[PDB]
Amino acid sequence: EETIFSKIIRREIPSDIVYQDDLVTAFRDISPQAPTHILIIPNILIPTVNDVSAEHEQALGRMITVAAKIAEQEGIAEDGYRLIMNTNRHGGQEVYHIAMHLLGGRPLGPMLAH
């Protein structure tokens, strides 16, 4: 059940890719929600965070280490930012290939609508 994210990874549909290595691809979100909104995803199809196992841990860590790098080069590192992963209906997960959202460029919070 490949999603559009695998075609993005493979440069078979256009996207603004900001970083890629053998574990991870990062690209700008097509419907951004903050001045910076970048997605960082594993190059392998893992549909939900429920599907992760210990073998994925390096790629999972790289997603965070890559978001940090990207936060710096976006000029958002000092003022700050948020990283978010959504899972299933309560999380609002829309694409079934795991993704960390990097959000920033302005004060962001609260974590959840009250």
Ligand X SMILES: Nc1nc2c(ncn2[C@@H]2O[C@H](COP(=O)(O)O)[C@@H](O)[C@H]2O)c(=O)[nH]1
User: Which residues contact a copy of itself by CB under 8 A?
Assistant: 33-34, 49-50, 52-54, 56-62, 64-65, 67-68, 71-72, 76-93, 101, 103-114
Taking alpha carbons only, the member of 25, 62, 29 closest to residue 45 is 25
Q: Which is nearer to ligand X, 54 or 110 (CB)?
A: 110
Q: Which is nearer to ligand X, 25 or 54 (CB)?
A: 25
d(CA 18, CA 90): 29
Per-residue tokens: 94: 């829309």
Which of ligand X, a copy of itself, none does residue 2 bind (CB under 5 to 8 Å by kind)?
Answer: none
Which H/E stretch holds residue 66? helix 57-73
Q: Are strands 17-20 and 24-28 parallel, antiparallel or unpaired?
A: antiparallel
Which of ligand X, a copy of itself, none does residue 27 bind (CB under 5 to 8 Å by kind)?
Answer: ligand X
